[PDB]
Amino acid sequence: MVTAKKDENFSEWYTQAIVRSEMIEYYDISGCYIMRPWAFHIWEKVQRFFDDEIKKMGVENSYFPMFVSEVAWVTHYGDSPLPEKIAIRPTSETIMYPAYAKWIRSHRDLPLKLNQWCSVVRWQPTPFLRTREFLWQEGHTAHATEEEAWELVLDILELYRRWYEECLAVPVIKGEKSEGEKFAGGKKTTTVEAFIPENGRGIQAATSHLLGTNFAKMFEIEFEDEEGHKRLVHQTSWGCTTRSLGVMIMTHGDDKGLVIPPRVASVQVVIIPILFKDENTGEILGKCRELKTMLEKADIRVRIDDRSNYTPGWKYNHWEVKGVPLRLELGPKDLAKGTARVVRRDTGEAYQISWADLAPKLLELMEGIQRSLFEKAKARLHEGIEKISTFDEVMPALNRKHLVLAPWCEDPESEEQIKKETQKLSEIQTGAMKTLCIPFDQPPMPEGTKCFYTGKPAKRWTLWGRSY
Amino acid sequence: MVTAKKDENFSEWYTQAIVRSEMIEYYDISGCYIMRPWAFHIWEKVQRFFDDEIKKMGVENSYFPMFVSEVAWVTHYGDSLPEKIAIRPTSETIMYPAYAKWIRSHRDLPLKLNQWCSVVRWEFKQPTPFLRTREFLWQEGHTAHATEEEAWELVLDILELYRRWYEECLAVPVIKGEKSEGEKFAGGKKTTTVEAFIPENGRGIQAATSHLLGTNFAKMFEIEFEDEEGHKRLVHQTSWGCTTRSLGVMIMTHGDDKGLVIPPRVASVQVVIIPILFKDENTGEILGKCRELKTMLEKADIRVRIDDRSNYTPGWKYNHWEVKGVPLRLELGPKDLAKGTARVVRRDTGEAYQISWADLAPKLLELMEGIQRSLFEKAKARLHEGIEKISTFDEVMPALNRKHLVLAPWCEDPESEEQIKKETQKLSEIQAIETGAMKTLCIPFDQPPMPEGTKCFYTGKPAKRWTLWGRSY
Ligand SMILES: [Cl-]
Ligand SMILES: [Cl-]
Ligand SMILES: [Cl-]
Ligand SMILES: [Cl-]
Ligand SMILES: [Cl-]
Ligand SMILES: [Cl-]
Ligand SMILES: [Cl-]
Numbered sequence: 001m002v003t004a005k006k007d008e009n010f011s012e013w014y015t016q017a018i019v020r021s022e023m024i025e026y027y028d029i030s031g032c033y034i035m036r037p038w039a040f041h042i043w044e045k046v047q048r049f050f051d052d053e054i055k056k057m058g059v060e061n062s063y064f065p066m067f068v069s070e071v072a073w074v075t076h077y078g079d080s081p082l083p084e085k086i087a088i089r090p091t092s093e094t095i096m097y098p099a100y101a102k103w104i105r106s107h108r109d110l111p112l113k114l115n116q117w118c119s120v121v122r123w124q125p126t127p128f129l130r131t132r133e134f135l136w137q138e139g140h141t142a143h144a145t146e147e148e149a150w151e152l153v154l155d156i157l158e159l160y161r162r163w164y165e166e167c168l169a170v171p172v173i174k175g176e177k178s179e180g181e182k183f184a185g186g187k188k189t190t191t192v193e194a195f196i197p198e199n200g201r202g203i204q205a206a207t208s209h210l211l212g213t214n215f216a217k218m219f220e221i222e223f224e225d226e227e228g229h230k231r232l233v234h235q236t237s238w239g240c241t242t243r244s245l246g247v248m249i250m251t252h253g254d255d256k257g258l259v260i261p262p263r264v265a266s267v268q269v270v271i272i273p274i275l276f277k278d279e280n281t282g283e284i285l286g287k288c289r290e291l292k293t294m295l296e297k298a299d300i301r302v303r304i305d306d307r308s309n310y311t312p313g314w315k316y317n318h319w320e321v322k323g324v325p326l327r328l329e330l331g332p333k334d335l336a337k338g339t340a341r342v343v344r345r346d347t348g349e350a351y352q353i354s355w356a357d358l359a360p361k362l363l364e365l366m367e368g369i370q371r372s373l374f375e376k377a378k379a380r381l382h383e384g385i386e387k388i389s390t391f392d393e394v395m396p397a398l399n400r401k402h403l404v405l406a407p408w409c410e411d412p413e414s415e416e417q418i419k420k421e422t423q424k425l426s427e428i429q430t431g432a433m434k435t436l437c438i439p440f441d442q443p444p445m446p447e448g449t450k451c452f453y454t455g456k457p458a459k460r461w462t463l464w465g466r467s468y
Numbered sequence: 469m470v471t472a473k474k475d476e477n478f479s480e481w482y483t484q485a486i487v488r489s490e491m492i493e494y495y496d497i498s499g500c501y502i503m504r505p506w507a508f509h510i511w512e513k514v515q516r517f518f519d520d521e522i523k524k525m526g527v528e529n530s531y532f533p534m535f536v537s538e539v540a541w542v543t544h545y546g547d548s549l550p551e552k553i554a555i556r557p558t559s560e561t562i563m564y565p566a567y568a569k570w571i572r573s574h575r576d577l578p579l580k581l582n583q584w585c586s587v588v589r590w591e592f593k594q595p596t597p598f599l600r601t602r603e604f605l606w607q608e609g610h611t612a613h614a615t616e617e618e619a620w621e622l623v624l625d626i627l628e629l630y631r632r633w634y635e636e637c638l639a640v641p642v643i644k645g646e647k648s649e650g651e652k653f654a655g656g657k658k659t660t661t662v663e664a665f666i667p668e669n670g671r672g673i674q675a676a677t678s679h680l681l682g683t684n685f686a687k688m689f690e691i692e693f694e695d696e697e698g699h700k701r702l703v704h705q706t707s708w709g710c711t712t713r714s715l716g717v718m719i720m721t722h723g724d725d726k727g728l729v730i731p732p733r734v735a736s737v738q739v740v741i742i743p744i745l746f747k748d749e750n751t752g753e754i755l756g757k758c759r760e761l762k763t764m765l766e767k768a769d770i771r772v773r774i775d776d777r778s779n780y781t782p783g784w785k786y787n788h789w790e791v792k793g794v795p796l797r798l799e800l801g802p803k804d805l806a807k808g809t810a811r812v813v814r815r816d817t818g819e820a821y822q823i824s825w826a827d828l829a830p831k832l833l834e835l836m837e838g839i840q841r842s843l844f845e846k847a848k849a850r851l852h853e854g855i856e857k858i859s860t861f862d863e864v865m866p867a868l869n870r871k872h873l874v875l876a877p878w879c880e881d882p883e884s885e886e887q888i889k890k891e892t893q894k895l896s897e898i899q900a901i902e903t904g905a906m907k908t909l910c911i912p913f914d915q916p917p918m919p920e921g922t923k924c925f926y927t928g929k930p931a932k933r934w935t936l937w938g939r940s941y
Contacts, residue, residue, distance in 0.1 A: 025566055028537050029553065034566060037528035037581070044529065060505035061512060065603055066586065069496050073544040074555070077590060086497065088542065099493055099502060108777045114505070118586070119534060123545055133533055309575040 001317055002257040010198045015127075017249060021258045021322045024127050031125035031132030035242075038322060039128075041266040043135060043242055046167050047117060050137060050240070053159050057152075059113040059139060064095050072123065092116065093237075096140055097219040104233060106224045107144050111152070115139040128246030129203070129468060136241035142221060142233040146212070149234035153210045156238045157190050160206035163240060168248040169261040169374040170194055171381050172205045173463065175437025179412045186237075187212030193436045193463065194247050195381050200401025202436040203468040205247060206240035251377050252346075258323030259345055261373050262366035268301040269342075269362060270319045274312050274331030288330055291340065291358065298359040300366075320345060325369050326362060344369055385463070387443075391453050394464075395425055398433060403465035407458030409451035410438075418453055418464075436463040469787055470727045478668040482596070482720065489728045489792045492597050499595040499602035503712075506792060509736040510715055511605060514637050515584060518607065518710070521629050525622075527580040527609060532562050540590055555588055560707075563610055564689040571693050571703060574614055580622075582609040587711075598716025599941065606711040612691065612703040616682065619704040623660055623678045626708045630662045630676035633710060638718040639731040639843040640664060641851045642675050643936065645910025649882040657682035663909045663936065665851050666720050670871025672909040672938040675717060678708040721847050722816075728793030729816055731843050732836035739765060739812075739832060740789045741774040744782050744801030758800050761810065761828065768829040770836075790815060795839050796832060816842060855936070857916075861926045864937075865895055868906060873938035877931030879924035880911070888926055888937070909936045 002020055004013040018024050023039035035043075051061075067074075068087045075085045089095065096114070104112060121133050128134075139156065143149040157174060164170045172192040176182070182189030192205040215221070216232040225231050252259040262268050273288045275281050285306060292302050305315050312329075319327055329341040340358065342351045346369050353361045386397045387405045397404050408414070415435055423432040438460050451458045470488060472480040486492050491507035503511070519529070535542075539554045556562060563581075571579060584607050592600050609626065613619040627644055634640040642662040652659035658680035664673050686692070686702035695701050722729040732738050741762060743754045755776060762772045775785050782799070789797060797813045804810050810828060813820045816839050823831050856867040857875045867874050878884075889905045896904025911933050922931045 025569075027533060029533065029535055032533040032535065034533065034562075035531035037530050040529050040531055060509070062505055062508050063503040063511075063586070063605065065495060065497065065500040065502065066588070067497050067500060067602070070546060072542050074540050075543045076541045078538055095495075095502070102493075106779065108779060119531070121534065133535070135531065307575065309573075 002255065002321060006253060006255055007198060014250065017253050017257050018127055033127055033131065039245060042245060042260065042264050045264040046163055046244060049167055050159060050163055054115055054139065057155065059115050062114045062116060064092060064116060068094050088121070092138060093215065097215055097221065100142055101219050101221045104142060104221055104223050107226055110142060110144045110223060110233065111148065112142040129243055134242045136239050138239040139237065141236045144223065144233070146234045149236050150210055153190055153208045153236050157192065157208040160192050160208065160240055164192065164205055164244065165374060167264050168244060169370055169377060170247050170251045171374065171378040173437065173439055175439040175463065177437060178410065178415055178435040180415050181435055183209045185214055186210065191437050195384055195403060196250050197380050197384055197401065200384065200466060201468050202403055202465040203247065205244065208238040209236060211235040211237055252373050257321035260323040260325060262325045262370045265301065265325055267303045267324045268366060269295060269326045269328055270324045271302060271304040271328045271330065272312060272315050273304070273306055274329060276332065280332045280335065284330060284332065284335055287335060291355065295359055295362065298363060300359070300362060325366060346372060389452055394422065394433065398422070398466060403436065403463055405461050405463055406452040407445065407449050408460065408462040409454055409456040410459045411454065414454050431466065433464050434467055436465055436467065438462050470725065470791055474723060474725050475668055485723055485727050486597050486719065499592050501597050501601065506736055507715060510734045511712060513734040514633055514714060517637050518629060518633055522582055522609065525580070525625060527582050530581050530583060532559060532583060536561065538590065559583065559608060564685060564691065567612060568689050568691045571612060571691055573694050574696050576693060577614045577703065578611060578618065580611045582607055598712050598719065604712045606709050608709040609707060611706045616704045619706050620680055623680045623706050626678040627660050627662060630678065630710055633714065634662065634675055635844060637733050638714060639840055639847065640718055640721050641844060641848040643910060643912050645912040645936065647910055648880065648885055648908040650885050651908050653679050655684055656680060661910045664717050665854050665873060667850050667854055667871065670868065670939055671941050672873055673717060673941040675714065676710040679706060681705040681707060722843050727791035729843070730793035730795060732795045732840050735795055736771065737773040737794050738771045738836060739796045739798055740794045741772060741798045741800060742782055742785050743774065743776060744799060746781065747778060753805060754800060757805060761800070761825065765829055765832065768833060770832060795836060814839060859925055864892065868892065868939060873936055875934050875936050876925040877918065877922045878933065878935040879927050879929040880932045881927065884927050904939060906937050907940050909938055909940065911935050
């Protein structure tokens with residue numbers, strides 16, 4: 001059972017929700033966690049979804065060593081030292097890019113498209129959101145042209161929007177990072193941003209980089225043009241991590257614990273046979289098994305919780321804290337009437353559905369729930385963004401736990417100034433406010449509109465806020 | 469092109485085939501390889517098949533951390549770490565303290581976990597991709613049950629999946645069996661196995677294992693639960709794993725002198741379309757029909773690739789896809805455009821078929837089935853031809869020298885195995901003068917009859933069970 005209130009002690013509510021739903025287990029190296037089936041199976045769903053979509057695009061998977069010759073060093077084995085100290089892979093570029101130079105010779109070798117599903121390590125932790133060790137996906141492509149490369153960068157970004165909005169039901173905002181927030185080696189970084197109302201922080205959801213040609217020049221990734229001319233390749237890289245799970249929990253969770261969007265739920269309907277005195281139990285258990293079969297033929301994912309060592313009441317709370325969307329109760333009365341009682345997790349509403357009507361009615365409720373979760377979350381995000389024009393509007397907005405959309409000249413130096421300044425003021429009253437992205441969806445920029453900070457001509461509207 | 473002959477130069481053969489098929493790239497750290505798609509997608513398909521099957525059993529996936537508090541130590545970050553930390557040696561050290569916390573009552577049982585991941589084994593000797601590597605991919609399962617009976621049952625269920633992984637997906641025949649006391653897992657009580665055979669060097673190779681760990685691990689980590697009557701019991705555990713070795717085994721089993729032969733059930737591309745074009749001839753007539761034929765074939769779920777690359781001849785493409793072991797090649801030339809047919813070539817036998825465009829999808833599904841059945845049947849016939857049923861130790865060296873295994877009546881005494889290993893190691897060296905040790909591979913589940921007085925082929929003590937021996941990987 002979850003006792004901490006989401007809107008009162010947020011970090012405590014969160015720890016409760018993930019721990020009490022059996023998603024994680026804690027561990028003696030800080031920033032490292034055991035990922036349990038309840039969390040891992042949800043990751044399987046999005047992984048499957050993304051994997052299928054990238055295969056449609058002709059992307060292939062592969063696996064690279066975790067060892068190369070910033071860095072973390074394996075220097076000893078036992079007590080004997082290593083004749084050469086071997087590095088754990090800091091980043092994949094080190095290995096993939098030499099290999100790309102050797103595999104690419106002609107335009108006939110392009111585009112080259114590889115992805116990896118693996119875990120990675122980094123070196124003040126929060127489960128899912130910021131960990132020393134996570135699962136992710138990372139893709140690296142090589143093209144003959146920038147247009148082709150750029151088209152892939154956006155296609156992936158669109159898949160990341162889908163992963164969040166279609167699967168996780170989390171609304172996200174597409175945009176470019178500032179010069180100071182993009183990948184430093186790369187030409188151009190696109191991103192997806194989410195928002196956590198309860199502490200008003202923005203959080204980067206996934207990223208898709210147009211890397212251009214620097215790494216190609218650096219690793220001599222070169223190809224023969226159709227006319228026989230030596231050209232550099234145009235590269236992209238992209239990734240999305242198990243952070244996405246964090247955001248989903250934080251977005252849809254309520255006081256009773258997890259709420260899982262049907263489209264990614266391991267168990268969509270849990271069936272709970274009510275036993276009170278042992279005269280009707282056989283018929284009841286038998287019916288449930290039939291309903292499971294009937295529902296499964298409609299692609300519904302179902303688990304009968306017929307464990308005899310637990311009460312009906314214990315089962316409700318259990319499947320509620322785990323966030324199963326739909327609970328179906330079948331007791332002696334329900335059996336006699338030919339019906340089942342169904343309760344949605346998002347709202348608590350209960351329905352009495354007759355056996356024949358069950359598949360279509362559950363299919364429909366799940367769509368209702370999935371959509372309802374997203375729209376509620378979308379409404380919240382819009383409610384958390386304040387359009388503003390002057391810097392003095394900023395601190396009052398951040399105290400409302402809101403983000404801000406403001407006209408900015410896009411001067412990198414101004415962004416550092418803005419970071420420092422907002423940090424400084426937040427202390428008097430980290431607290432810093434930084435660019436989250438410059439949205440693809442730009443409102444109009446009336447002529448002569450000034451940057452909200454420097455007074456100079458504003459170039460574009462920028463999403464700002466406190467951040468993870 | 470592959471230049472080494474599979475039975476004359478087996479190792480060289482194997483090395484050419486994996487590289488020229490573009491299954492792997494080489495890497496500056498020895499025993500470490502990049503696994504390119506042609507290889508990795510075969511891993512993807514077996515993983516899918518296996519992961520579907522264990523979910524039906526209630527096994528659930530999880531992810532345990534790669535680092536911990538014979539070990540490889542990470543000591544610095546840049547130029548510098550306070551506690552020297554370690555790449556996870558086995559998974560038991562992290563997993564079993566967690567099982568100890570998770571298990572308290574009979575209601576918590578059974579507990580069935582699995583992990584898909586990469587592993588580092590630091591000691592490898594001489595490196596060969598899929599066979600002897602620093603890093604590999606695997607799955608490892610770990611369960612815990614109220615009774616030994618239930619766990620044992622799970623062990624055998626898992627072993628059955630391992631037979632299916634090999635025989636159904638990779639068309640590799642295997643033999644289920646019990647390991648001997650000296651070949652089993654040290655700490656466990658019973659260990660079952662799935663063995664394969666490599667005709668070209670006469671070696672057996674362990675394909676996968678499923679262990680009845682019993683309770684000694686429970687005792688060591690204090691994984692106890694309370695009985696349904698309040699008594700503290702130790703859990704009965706299992707574990708089981710299957711690695712990328714499965715692929716090296718598939719490679720060895722079906723390959724021939726032109727290169728790889730990949731079973732249609734796991735081939736990344738099942739049907740390569742090869743437009744009979746030359747440089748700057750393209751008029752769209754050939755590519756056009758090729759694309760239509762592709763679309764038509766994917767409507768029957770055939771995995772299809774057109775090789776439209778402009779700067780290679782058809783002959784070079786024929787060889788390139790043969791080396792890669794694509795099961796089926798479909799050739800579309802001007803002549804075929806004129807006759808309303810395609811010519812398709814079976815990779816496994818060379819046999820060619822003239823097939824009319826409308827017959828292609830049903831005739832190709834049928835061919836792929838046949839290729840899949842044939843690969844298994846021919847490997848199974850080879851497997852049973854490689855096994856000699858014997859009565860005494862004398863018949864041993866001659867059989868080893870025919871690159872075969874032996875099936876012998878054995879008393880199962882653990883010291884005899886160590887002896888049988890030494891003697892054969894010694895006799896092999898004698899011949900080298902003018903490696904070689906023979907061990908138990910398994911005690912097969914499938915027991916032929918055992919007449920009343922039958923003696924142990926080596927000690928003369930009365931024999932207990934028939935036992936499969938051979939030289940080994
Ligand atoms: Cl938090
Ligand atoms: Cl899935
Ligand atoms: Cl990346
Ligand atoms: Cl924070
Ligand atoms: Cl070999
Ligand atoms: Cl194991
Ligand atoms: Cl088939």
